[PDB]
């Protein structure tokens, strides 16, 4: 048993809810929240900007030190940093950004990072402002992630469409 509430069960391991991931993280305090990061860990908008704002910019301060030491992530890659006030850990995962011209085939590699964690609260990778088709992102998630993932879908209209169209 875990603390996640009100999710629709899609598969053995994938659950989904219409939720603000910031509000969900604040309520659940999961072991792992996933950030929709870029390779620079520059948390300006979407989930990253919202998560970072909720940490009072502490996520960005920690991230800048990480990049100064290690250099940028890879598209498809990840790093584990603090979850600050939102979670034990934040798994920063870089899905391909279609609005920057990145290979959508990298989305499966991005989701493979989730398999290193038994349970995660996460957004749909490459969805929202990263420009991918969220229906596709959900299909790759279901077909890639084997650990237990709780997906927060910000947009109520997209949530309804993802559930209704799910195979």
The footprint of ligand 51X (CB under 6 A) covers: 123-124, 127-128, 134, 153-155, 158
For 150, the enclosing helix (H) or strand (E) is strand 148-153
Q: Closest distance between ligand 51X and the C-beta of residue 51, in Å?
A: 13
User: Between 30 and 134, whose beta carbon lies closer to ligand 51X?
Assistant: 134
Q: Closest distance between ligand 51X and the C-beta of residue 136, in Å?
A: 11
Give the neighbor-by-neighbor strand order of the sheet with 14-18. Answer: 8-9, 14-18, 148-153, 119-122, 32-36, 89-93, 78-82
Number of CB atoms found within 10 A of residue 42's CB: 16
Are the beta carbons of 92 and 41 closer than 8 angstroms? yes
User: Between 96 and 134, whose beta carbon lies closer to ligand 51X?
Assistant: 134
Where b means 16+ CB within 10 Å and e means fewer, 126-150 reads bbbebbbebeebbbbbbebbeebbb
User: Between 98 and 119, whose beta carbon lies closer to ligand 51X?
Assistant: 98
Q: Closest distance between ligand 51X and the C-beta of residue 27, in Å?
A: 17
Q: Closest distance between ligand 51X and the C-beta of residue 134, in Å?
A: 4
**Residue 131 structure tokens:** 């420009």
User: Between 104 and 158, whose beta carbon lies closer to ligand 51X?
Assistant: 158
**Residue 13 structure tokens:** 């391991």
Q: Closest distance between ligand 51X and the C-beta of residue 15, in Å?
A: 14
User: Between 70 and 165, whose beta carbon lies closer to ligand 51X?
Assistant: 165
């Amino acid at each position: 048993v875990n603390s996640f509430s009100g999710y629709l069960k899609l598969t053995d391991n994938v659950y989904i809810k219409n939720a603000d991931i910031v509000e969900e993280a604040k309520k659940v305090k999961p072991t792992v929240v996933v950030n929709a990061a870029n390779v620079y860990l520059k948390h300006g908008g979407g989930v990253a900007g919202a998560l970072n704002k909720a940490t009072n910019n502490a996520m960005q301060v920690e991230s800048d030190d990480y990049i100064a030491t290690n250099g940028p992530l890879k598209v498809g890659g990840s790093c584990v940093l603090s979850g600050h006030n939102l979670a034990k850990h934040c798994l920063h995962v870089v899905g391909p950004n279609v609005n920057k011209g990145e290979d959508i085939q990298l989305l499966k590699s991005a989701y493979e990072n989730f398999n290193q964690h038994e349970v995660l609260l996460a957004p749909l990778l490459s969805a929202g402002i990263f420009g991918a088709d969220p229906i596709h992102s959900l299909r790759v998630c279901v077909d890639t992630v084997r650990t237990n993932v709780y997906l927060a879908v910000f947009d109520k209209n997209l949530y309804d469409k993802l559930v209704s169209s799910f195979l």
